[PDB]
């Protein structure tokens, strides 16, 4: 008159422990501790102790069936680990409700945070605590660049059926190439925050990574996420295997992939084919529009000092970067006149 | 059990990937790419399709002459020209599966490769993407192919 | 008076598991949960839970 | 100024993280100043050796994220560099980079560093700790012989 259900190390597993931690009508002994890096706005006083159900047996009520959970490890501990449920009324219909509720709780994105996944073996894993969403107006790119990328992305996400009707694989790839300190990674964070998508950062220079593992990682991304390939020019992966992973019979479906470089010419023409990298945009050094909007972002309000600042930058005739401008504005916090005085310091680079 | 697992879904192609010395399904089945969606040059699609159908039809003719019943096709050209797309379309047309094999995989040996090529699932197409890229030996690959 | 067939990591083993999952006459008090993607052209791809024995 | 203005960074979306570089001839007081400043702030020192062979990119990201609170990250001889260059660059400033950390780097060969590592979002403050000046000579004599 009992019906037991288990699940091994899969995506449904961690969702289920996260759900069981939050379950109110729970009677758990055999609990475990878990320190985590919580954060306050003034400063992150981390190491908040959290008590989790941990290994052993637990009683939860849920909808009125009194389910017994059993978390236990084996010879090893992430190997050899499993939870087990038992219902005493042949009410196995509650198991799918439990799984769906756990999936919804886990998939619920925190309203002002962006989740970062990192490749750990052949599957993705949460990295650290979720980071606060970077806002799109903070990232000062050139005129039309931000709008062009956003229009292309929204056009791709909206037109799902249009791809399938014509047989084109529903997958888009974007390249941001340019000098260092131009806003590429910052724009990735901002756009992922805008779409409320996660980021799956993947490092191909990882020696343990192989072609089969690469294809599994590319095909097992969590839903509502963006694949990030920082420094695609850096490259145990093979060139043909990477090319087939990006666009091939083995390539996945409904993915946004982003790659950034400082050396676009180092890329082969095969990787730059317009079916692997569909959109490529040059995120260059600071332009006077960028200088003016960066100054207005850091020093809102007054514009005459902004006008003098951008004129002095133009007279300085130096290929400044927006990272350099951000550093200068950080040095002179709430002092636009001091920044206008120290504008000559952007010339030095050693 | 064999009939259930061997039946193909009406509009999708299964993809098999070399995992050790045997094949296994990779991911969920992908929807069939249609042959009219692949724009190749005039007579190219028709010529390849006629040659493939002629080969599959004439099973006995190969055996009577003693020729090994096995055909090999090479699609060479510039990047982004339709090669992989045509492979997907033709495998969808024949209701065959694609068995993708990566020779640059370091754990692959000659004995493993012979076992893989001799144990493909029924009604499937072996796909060697970027044959020019190449623990496999040249002589072992040559003897495995013919 | 009984018979017993065993098959172990064979190409028919996965076939037998798939056939057993599809069997409606199955009465299994033990279940396993494995996530699977239900890919549908309408909307977006979604995950789904499979109660294999 | 950096430790005080925690909220000002968050308001403009800049990652709350600063990087310092001391460069110069050997024996100019770089390491000694690191110890003195860590003692002044009552912070610990987390010394990390990038040249250590068993260190990998995932391990380094975990180390730079799981630092103990109120501590200084010290990267002695940054120019010395299983870690990858791109992995180090993304660790110091990237999506995977941590928050509210002071990192200090020393080198006797600043020109051996790339432009990317010397970026003013990775290395914010760079000061030349050089050979002894007559002011330094006088102050050292006063310290040793009051
Ligand atoms: N256009 C920009 N608008 C706002 N902040 C910027 C901009 N460009 C750079 N920054 C800041 O400067 C730092 C570096 O910018 P990132 O975008 O993270 O790096 P990057 O431009 O991709 O250069 P790399 O080294 O190739 S990753 C971060 O602290 C950003 O906040
Ligand atoms: N002849 C074609 N007709 C229709 N779509 C095509 C054609 N050639 C390429 N495409 C599209 O272009 C993209 C890549 O085509 P592929 O055939 O995969 O590339 P390729 O020709 O195999 O070259 P590679 O780089 O060696 S794989 C896909 O989105 C295809 O739909
Ligand atoms: N400016 C200084 N003021 C006081 N003591 C100093 C100074 N420079 C050097 N010393 C002494 O000499 C030692 C060497 O200084 P360190 O800072 O430890 O080494 P360094 O200057 O970093 O040179 P290296 O070889 O690049 S680590 C210190 O431990 C002090 O004992």
Residue numbers in the entry:
A (entry chain D): 84 to 160, 167 to 324, 339 to 453
B (entry chain E): 191 to 324, 339 to 350
C (entry chain E): 84 to 136
D (entry chain C): 244 to 324, 339 to 403
Extract from the study:
For bc1 complex (complex III) assembly, the iron–sulfur protein Rip1 must first be imported into the mitochondrial matrix to fold and acquire its 2Fe–2S cluster, then translocated and inserted into the inner mitochondrial membrane (IM). This translocation of folded Rip1 is accomplished by Bcs1, an unusual heptameric AAA ATPase that couples ATP hydrolysis to translocation. Here, contrary to most AAA-ATPases that form hexameric rings with rather narrow central pores, Bcs1 was shown to form heptameric rings with a significantly wider pore and two large vestibules. One protomer consists of three domains, a transmembrane helix (TMH) at the N-terminus, a Bcs1-specific β-sheet-containing middle domain and a C-terminal AAA cassette.
